[PDB]
Design a protein around this nucleic acid. Sequence first.
DNA 1: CGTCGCCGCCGCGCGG
DNA 2: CGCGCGGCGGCGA
Length: 900
Amino acid sequence: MKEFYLTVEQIGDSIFERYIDSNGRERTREVEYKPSLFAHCPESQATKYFDIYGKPCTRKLFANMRDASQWIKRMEDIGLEALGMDDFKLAYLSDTYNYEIKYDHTKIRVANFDIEVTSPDGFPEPSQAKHPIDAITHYDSIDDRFYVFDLLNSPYGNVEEWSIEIAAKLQEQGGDEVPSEIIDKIIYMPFDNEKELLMEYLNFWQQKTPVILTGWNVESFAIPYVYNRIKNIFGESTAKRLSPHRKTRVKVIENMYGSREIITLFGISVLDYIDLYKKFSFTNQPSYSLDYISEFELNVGKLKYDGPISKLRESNHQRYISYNIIAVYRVLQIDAKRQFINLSLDMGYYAKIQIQSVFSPIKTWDAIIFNSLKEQNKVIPQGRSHPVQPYPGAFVKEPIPNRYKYVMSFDLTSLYPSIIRQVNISPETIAGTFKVAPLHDYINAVAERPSDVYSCSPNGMMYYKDRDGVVPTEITKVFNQRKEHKGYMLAAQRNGEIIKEALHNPNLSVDEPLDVDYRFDFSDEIKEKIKKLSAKSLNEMLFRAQRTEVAGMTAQINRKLLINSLAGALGNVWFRYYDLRNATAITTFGQMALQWIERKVNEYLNEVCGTEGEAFVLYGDTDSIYVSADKIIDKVGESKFRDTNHWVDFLDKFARERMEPAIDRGFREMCEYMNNKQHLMFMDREAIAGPPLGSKGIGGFWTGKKRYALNVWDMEGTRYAEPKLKIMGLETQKSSTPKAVQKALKECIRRMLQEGEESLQEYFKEFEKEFRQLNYISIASVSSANNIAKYDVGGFPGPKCPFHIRGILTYNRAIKGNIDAPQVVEGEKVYVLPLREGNPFGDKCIAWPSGTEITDLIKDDVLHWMDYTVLLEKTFIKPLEGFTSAAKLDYEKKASLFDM
DNA sequence: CGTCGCCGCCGCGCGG
DNA sequence: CGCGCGGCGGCGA
Ligand SMILES: Cc1cn([C@H]2C[C@H](O)[C@@H](COP(=O)(O)OP(=O)(O)OP(=O)(O)O)O2)c(=O)[nH]c1=O
Ligand SMILES: [Ca+2]
Ligand SMILES: [Ca+2]
Ligand SMILES: [Ca+2]
Ligand SMILES: [Ca+2]
Ligand SMILES: [Ca+2]
């Protein structure tokens, strides 16, 4: 096979590399790598190395990496550019793997672990590590086994061995309901003392050294606790055995609030799953406990136990160990679904970076670009110092707040990357500048043509048309990958809707799910078989369809994020190719493109309908437009349609056959105007929205910029079995809004758009009556706990203290002097509740860590003093009044003459 | 060390 | 609750 690296590190003058050899075996080597850097030379000397501007360079080969680094410093002291890859391990990887990397995931050791630490005196601080580690479950991807290390004797209690038999039994049998599919995969090892446990762990770690190290909060907890506990018991050199090269560093993350010291293990790539999940999942959650994320992702119940966790080992060691094992598997199950590890490996190997660098698009793009340029013997520029400067972004149209019955949206495919490709925006393609007219002049096509030679953006920039820049070239490759995966995703989604439809008539039989590839549209043959299947098989197929969809979503949306990050990186000072001329060229062009097509769509539809000056485009944001279709529907007449799907077909056909061709012509004209290198402004129909035929639903409404709701029947070619609410910006979409409130506000909107004013009034009235029965968690707001110490004055709110910080301070006073109460962690999420006047907490609100029940100490008092009225007024009624007034509806029935 | 736009809540200090 | 301004949180692109 083709060799591929596992991990790479620079230690002084040595590259330490772990890799898979041609035989598929893990090896390690130390290389005294001689790096090269470059300096400009006279045009009058022979060379094959040139910078991106075509200036000739001479290669400087160094005896070792430290010499190379010192040369950089001397070049700074002289005042001359030191060119080339100054991250010597990226140069090493480029030299060693001078080909597209084919990796075999089965050869890569992915370790998933978690630890248990019994602690009576509060949260066990990793940097102190003063309490015994009493359980480690370490899953190994290569062995496919859960290795369980269990402490039997501790200063906090001596316990019996864990029973695998009881762990397999149902909870109703007194068991732990450890899923049957992993029972045979548990290798259980009890220990009489913590020393032997840790020594055996390290020996085990030596035999099965993780390449990818993951788990839940392992970077902030498990890793530093294990390292520090071992350091406390045995000394540093023994702790350093967690690194295959025996080197570690104790380092902080730079922020703007506080600091936390994490452990860098040289020769391992740590990908904490919480960090994988936060970057790649495209959610914001009220809580990031594994219980919460597991319930959300997998619909599994919370791990249930009595008393505090600090007493669990003592009271019920059986369950303690089982819940440790189950916690590991749940991360595996989340990954099986989301596929973030797979995504990380893909991106990592593509860029030829340390895998853990996927968290950093700047590092990723820096390495992609460097490899692309090196292939052509081109030399990258030195990174420079730049002051942070604000620059303009997208255009957003101000909508007229109103109901909107029929709506068709259109959206530009991958806007910013396509602008980069169309215009040819790249560091080395800058051709010069032209004299800019006000942007509206370009929008209305009244400004003089920018250039007859070069490709232009209305910010004044000009670019070469003779050849593609490295940015367009490299961004196009990832874009194409993205497109493929989006194709798989949408097809899985369409297939899902076919299964949903079929589920309306399940056939009563014993049968199996069809063996199909969900990434491809179901054939007619498959459709007919599905029409003959039982609910059991259809539901299992739907589950499989939805899993394929999720897999496709992960692959596509994060490649989208990566290509969009290239456009953003051009506006970040740490990017090697930082250039505000290029970042602004993208965004200004975007503002022109949007407003230009607004004009064209308006001009086109006015002609179709025989009017003048009327606005059809009601809204737009960045690259999408929302077109009112009322008049199109009205021109045929609502009476003429058989059912909802019929007018949906009609709008789909009208958008695909009349509007899209007009949109294309309008954009082809803009391309010529700007003299761009390649027409790539592709604006397709996205949504078809409206109320059900014959109903009193309003279809959609806008309250303002980035705030609207639509009743969608068709989204980029996916015809839904049941209409789906597209809601943006409104309170239903915010992680800060109470759960039950999100739910009720969503149902109010559903009723408004699908059913009408009377249905909405019927629901509101019922919610208002029953609201006081809602569980306190379901009605708590959520916020992030930032800068607590800034607003802490003696335990009481300082000047300008935010509401939620006030709540935290109230909580702190209430729990003061209590070792075992959950402390609020700076930066993490809190639930927030209003408190009625004259409560014992001595303030108007209280906040506690999210995802958890509030400590039993103050729960009863919180539940008794919760201010439901404030809750109902602030989180529900005020948002609802905002919706309804915008939609010109009343949520409460107004009095009429009929009341006699 | 991808970006900007822009919403609503809140504290504050008004606003004769 | 009448109002904007700045801080904040949190999405929407
Ligand atoms: C989502 C997102 C968009 N944008 C900008 C760049 C996008 O091109 C532009 C439009 O956003 P989107 O329409 O959400 O995304 P897109 O056009 O790039 O991709 P798609 O084909 O799925 O429509 O807004 C960002 O800068 N960062 C982001 O995270
Ligand atoms: Ca635990
Ligand atoms: Ca788009
Ligand atoms: Ca599209
Ligand atoms: Ca059937
Ligand atoms: Ca869009």
